[PDB]
Write a protein that holds these residues in place. Structure first.
Motif, PDB file in Angstrom:
ATOM      1  N   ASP A 137     -35.259 -41.513 -67.548  1.00 43.51           N
ATOM      2  CA  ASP A 137     -35.889 -42.327 -66.903  1.00 43.51           C
ATOM      3  C   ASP A 137     -35.439 -42.438 -65.003  1.00 43.51           C
ATOM      4  O   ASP A 137     -34.087 -42.083 -65.069  1.00 43.51           O
ATOM      5  CB  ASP A 137     -35.437 -43.976 -66.980  1.00 43.51           C
ATOM      6  N   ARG A 155     -35.278 -44.061 -62.586  1.00 40.44           N
ATOM      7  CA  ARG A 155     -35.022 -44.342 -61.956  1.00 40.44           C
ATOM      8  C   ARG A 155     -32.918 -44.569 -62.148  1.00 40.44           C
ATOM      9  O   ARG A 155     -32.325 -45.226 -61.232  1.00 40.44           O
ATOM     10  CB  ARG A 155     -35.269 -46.178 -62.295  1.00 40.44           C
ATOM     11  N   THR A 156     -32.612 -43.714 -63.027  1.00 36.86           N
ATOM     12  CA  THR A 156     -31.215 -43.351 -63.703  1.00 36.86           C
ATOM     13  C   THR A 156     -30.808 -42.047 -62.580  1.00 36.86           C
ATOM     14  O   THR A 156     -29.505 -41.572 -63.426  1.00 36.86           O
ATOM     15  CB  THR A 156     -31.350 -43.612 -65.125  1.00 36.86           C
ATOM     16  N   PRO A 198     -29.065 -40.894 -60.361  1.00 38.65           N
ATOM     17  CA  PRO A 198     -27.583 -39.897 -60.388  1.00 38.65           C
ATOM     18  C   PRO A 198     -27.193 -39.808 -61.499  1.00 38.65           C
ATOM     19  O   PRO A 198     -26.326 -38.986 -61.471  1.00 38.65           O
ATOM     20  CB  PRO A 198     -27.259 -41.207 -59.393  1.00 38.65           C
ATOM     21  N   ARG A 199     -27.217 -40.417 -62.486  1.00 38.47           N
ATOM     22  CA  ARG A 199     -27.143 -40.032 -63.826  1.00 38.47           C
ATOM     23  C   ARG A 199     -27.425 -38.609 -64.047  1.00 38.47           C
ATOM     24  O   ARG A 199     -26.749 -38.021 -64.350  1.00 38.47           O
ATOM     25  CB  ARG A 199     -27.556 -41.005 -64.411  1.00 38.47           C
ATOM     26  N   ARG A 229     -26.111 -35.590 -62.372  1.00 40.50           N
ATOM     27  CA  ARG A 229     -24.285 -35.527 -62.801  1.00 40.50           C
ATOM     28  C   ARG A 229     -24.779 -34.629 -64.453  1.00 40.50           C
ATOM     29  O   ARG A 229     -24.060 -34.074 -64.251  1.00 40.50           O
ATOM     30  CB  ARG A 229     -23.933 -37.136 -63.356  1.00 40.50           C
ATOM     31  N   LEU A 235     -32.879 -42.269 -48.607  1.00 40.41           N
ATOM     32  CA  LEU A 235     -31.985 -41.582 -48.651  1.00 40.41           C
ATOM     33  C   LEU A 235     -31.247 -42.402 -47.239  1.00 40.41           C
ATOM     34  O   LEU A 235     -30.025 -42.250 -47.317  1.00 40.41           O
ATOM     35  CB  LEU A 235     -31.856 -39.740 -48.227  1.00 40.41           C
ATOM     36  N   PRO A 286     -19.079 -29.180 -53.438  1.00 41.56           N
ATOM     37  CA  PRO A 286     -18.680 -29.817 -53.081  1.00 41.56           C
ATOM     38  C   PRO A 286     -16.915 -29.682 -53.103  1.00 41.56           C
ATOM     39  O   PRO A 286     -15.951 -29.640 -52.709  1.00 41.56           O
ATOM     40  CB  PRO A 286     -18.611 -31.224 -54.152  1.00 41.56           C
ATOM     41  N   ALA A 287     -16.636 -28.243 -53.990  1.00 38.17           N
ATOM     42  CA  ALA A 287     -15.164 -28.281 -54.498  1.00 38.17           C
ATOM     43  C   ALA A 287     -14.199 -26.856 -53.369  1.00 38.17           C
ATOM     44  O   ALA A 287     -13.547 -27.888 -52.451  1.00 38.17           O
ATOM     45  CB  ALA A 287     -14.873 -27.355 -56.120  1.00 38.17           C
ATOM     46  N   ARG A 342     -22.814 -35.343 -51.448  1.00 47.24           N
ATOM     47  CA  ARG A 342     -21.253 -35.021 -51.622  1.00 47.24           C
ATOM     48  C   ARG A 342     -20.595 -34.202 -50.345  1.00 47.24           C
ATOM     49  O   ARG A 342     -19.312 -34.671 -49.822  1.00 47.24           O
ATOM     50  CB  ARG A 342     -20.715 -34.737 -52.874  1.00 47.24           C
ATOM     51  N   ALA A 401     -21.766 -33.412 -47.779  1.00 47.23           N
ATOM     52  CA  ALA A 401     -21.919 -33.995 -46.311  1.00 47.23           C
ATOM     53  C   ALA A 401     -20.714 -35.264 -45.814  1.00 47.23           C
ATOM     54  O   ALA A 401     -20.397 -35.555 -45.497  1.00 47.23           O
ATOM     55  CB  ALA A 401     -23.452 -34.701 -46.133  1.00 47.23           C
ATOM     56  N   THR A 402     -20.551 -35.939 -46.941  1.00 49.20           N
ATOM     57  CA  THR A 402     -19.435 -36.948 -47.597  1.00 49.20           C
ATOM     58  C   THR A 402     -17.621 -36.172 -46.750  1.00 49.20           C
ATOM     59  O   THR A 402     -17.657 -36.578 -45.733  1.00 49.20           O
ATOM     60  CB  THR A 402     -18.970 -37.202 -49.040  1.00 49.20           C
ATOM     61  N   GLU A 420     -26.881 -48.815 -62.873  1.00 50.03           N
ATOM     62  CA  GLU A 420     -27.708 -47.405 -63.388  1.00 50.03           C
ATOM     63  C   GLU A 420     -28.731 -47.081 -63.000  1.00 50.03           C
ATOM     64  O   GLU A 420     -29.334 -46.018 -63.321  1.00 50.03           O
ATOM     65  CB  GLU A 420     -29.674 -49.307 -65.029  1.00 50.03           C
ATOM     66  N   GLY A 425     -25.753 -44.721 -61.385  1.00 53.64           N
ATOM     67  CA  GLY A 425     -26.180 -43.529 -62.708  1.00 53.64           C
ATOM     68  C   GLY A 425     -24.749 -44.097 -63.646  1.00 53.64           C
ATOM     69  O   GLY A 425     -24.023 -43.810 -63.292  1.00 53.64           O
ATOM     70  N   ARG A 463     -18.024 -43.142 -51.265  1.00 50.73           N
ATOM     71  CA  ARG A 463     -17.417 -42.114 -51.162  1.00 50.73           C
ATOM     72  C   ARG A 463     -16.432 -42.096 -51.778  1.00 50.73           C
ATOM     73  O   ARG A 463     -15.573 -40.709 -51.453  1.00 50.73           O
ATOM     74  CB  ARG A 463     -17.515 -42.272 -49.555  1.00 50.73           C
ATOM     75  N   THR A 507     -16.297 -40.060 -54.387  1.00 54.01           N
ATOM     76  CA  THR A 507     -16.495 -38.840 -54.315  1.00 54.01           C
ATOM     77  C   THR A 507     -15.600 -37.920 -54.044  1.00 54.01           C
ATOM     78  O   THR A 507     -14.877 -36.872 -54.679  1.00 54.01           O
ATOM     79  CB  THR A 507     -17.235 -38.356 -53.337  1.00 54.01           C
ATOM     80  N   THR A 549     -13.474 -35.453 -56.828  1.00 56.19           N
ATOM     81  CA  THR A 549     -13.255 -33.631 -56.129  1.00 56.19           C
ATOM     82  C   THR A 549     -11.370 -33.215 -56.345  1.00 56.19           C
ATOM     83  O   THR A 549     -11.207 -32.298 -56.567  1.00 56.19           O
ATOM     84  CB  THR A 549     -13.664 -33.552 -54.716  1.00 56.19           C
TER      85      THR A 549
END
Ligand SMILES: [Mg+2]
Ligand SMILES: [Mg+2]
Lengths: 346, 344
Positions: A69, A71-72, A74-75, A78, A114, A238-239, A269, A271-272, B111, B114, B268, B271, B275
């Motif tokens: 789905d 709609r999920t 971000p999962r 990941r 976004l 991100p690391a 990430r 950008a954060t 959901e 995530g 945030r 995140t 990390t």
């Protein structure tokens, strides 16, 4: 909204000036929506070759993604990170197709979901390594095309680099700003000299003067100079972003490329991290179909920290597989009012 | 999905003397309802109930009216800009907007965030008090099915250590214990506490030192720091970045929505923590089920979450909503309903 189908193909895009390859990704949902993605792997920066990218985008290898789905999302992203850990360009093609789909599902341009921090930004176009005459000629061509920002590649040979920069500065006569990219070719003394010149000529910053694994060389610089330096090949995900932002911060600008980081999610990430650390964002590209350029632009226009774009990766393409997704006017890039990436596809 | 209306009200919830919460209702033009709750903690964030109320006043929210919920990340950035000193108010609005967006998409919030977890046990708290009352309250929490006890420490080592020893003996393995001295320990005392904590298998020590004392944390051996959690030292993403940066000050970040200002800044913080390899703990204030539910959705959506102290609605004698989370055998999970999953 379930993912119904995932198809990948290789596309050979001749350059106007030789050709360059992109993997093109179609994701279809059950209600018949189409998300689009494009992959342009850079093996020297990420280790990812075209063969490995293509292989990671195989329909059956992607079976885990079928029926999921959107709609999920971000999962899903990941899982893209976990299941395609060595193929960041492939990962990005999928990630961007999925974001395209979620934005279409909500009925808005991607940058709107976004969340929008910017209407448009100037993009650079690139002048590669060549002699003074060809450099000035290209500069005037670009000026005529409406571009206000030039990105000049440097080879690390100081007499030549510096000469090109002085002559370019004189020809431009304030008509465009310049930014430079030695791409790892400079040593420490050399960089100090280059930076004196850069200050002299009003050049905006220096991208990645030192070898990627040389970030100690950056940290050893005075803060005022570090602030004028952008990380590119030293920054993948991100690391890297966190290690570079950690006091003492290695530099003042992060160059994010979807094909380095692996998509819009990892880009958020980065950008954060940058924003918390007070680091400015640059958005670059590989040689790319307008699909991934568009994706990058939606992401950039949604980051408050974005100060700069080198988005010119689709300009030298003789042909492309889609139109729209972004509008170029007077050297500035913006997106359109259509939903998702806003691409027109046959 | 456009915001049609926003209403705030003050609820006084008797305990089982009283705690106040601000309740927020956001209605869209399509008839949908998001909910949020604010419980400001002034000694931590500086935010008073009066200030929170003022920040949430409908007449100050005109910029939010007519706004599209699908633009949520942008709305949250503006929340941060327009309510910089009122994190609890910000969180009430933020969670109400998330509730609405998840309803727009037709799924439980976790959901669309995530999901990384189905459930986790929550601690319940035993306040500062003598050995006997401590033990008795411990037996009472065990009988309600809790497997994790959060014990507040006062900084008097004799009393603290005896309480923890007697509690350990009485529990006889039936629950784990975590401790919260809340700023009351000095450096040597903390070393003694950590030795005792290793002896008794206590999970970790939350905020042993004054909030502005994180140099005291960094002075500790890394193995000890790993067993310490940051709470009053950690408000929002800036704090989390400075605590995570090498050398990292501690091993656990305690996120409270009333501290960081909502799900967005919580994301945030997460995140940064992921990390840096730091574990996440989700705490709370005295709060309606609304904001507990919000926190739980966010927590179940972070790979880094290892712990919950989510018990802040348990002692409310009444509440303005049902659902949003289920407690079973000391473990919290969300429901299958859309949005926060609350019944109003
Ligand atoms: Mg570069
Ligand atoms: Mg605490």
């Amino acid at each position: 909204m379930k993912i119904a189908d995932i198809q990948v193909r290789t596309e050979h895009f001749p350059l106007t000036r030789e050709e360059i390859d992109n993997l093109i990704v179609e994701i279809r949902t059950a209600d018949g929506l189409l998300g689009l993605g494009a992959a342009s792997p850079e093996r020297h920066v990420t280790g990812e070759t075209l063969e490995a990218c293509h292989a990671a985008l195989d329909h059956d290898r992607l079976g885990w993604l079928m029926g999921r789905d959107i709609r999920t999302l971000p999962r899903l992203c990941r899982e893209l990170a976990e299941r395609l850990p060595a193929a960041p360009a492939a990962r990005a093609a999928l990630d961007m197709a999925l974001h395209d789909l979620v934005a279409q599902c909500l009925g808005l341009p991607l940058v709107e979901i976004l969340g929008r921090a910017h209407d448009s930004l100037p993009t650079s176009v690139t002048i590669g390594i060549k002699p003074v005459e060809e450099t000035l000629a290209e500069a005037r061509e670009h000026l005529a095309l409406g571009f206000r920002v030039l990105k000049v590649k440097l080879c690390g040979d100081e007499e030549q680099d510096f000469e090109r920069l002085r002559r370019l500065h004189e020809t431009l006569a304030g008509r465009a700003v310049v930014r430079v990219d030695p791409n790892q070719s400079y040593d420490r003394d050399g960089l100090l000299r280059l930076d004196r010149l850069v200050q002299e000529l009003g050049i905006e910053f220096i991208e990645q003067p030192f070898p990627a694994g040389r970030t100690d060389w950056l940290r050893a610089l005075p803060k005022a100079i570090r602030r004028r330096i952008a990380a590119d090949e030293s920054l993948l995900g991100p690391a890297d972003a966190f290690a570079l932002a950690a006091p003492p911060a290695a530099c003042g600008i992060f160059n994010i490329k979807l094909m380095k980081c692996g998509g819009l999610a990892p880009a958020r990430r980065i950008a954060t991290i940058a924003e918390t650390a007070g680091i400015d964002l640059m958005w670059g590209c590989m040689d790319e179909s307008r699909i991934s350029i568009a994706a990058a632009l939606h992401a950039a226009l949604a980051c408050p920290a974005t100060r700069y774009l080198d988005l010119d990766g689709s300009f030298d393409l003789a042909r492309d597989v889609a139109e729209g997704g972004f509008i170029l006017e007077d050297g500035r890039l913006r997106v359109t009012e259509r939903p998702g990436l806003g691409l027109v596809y046959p």
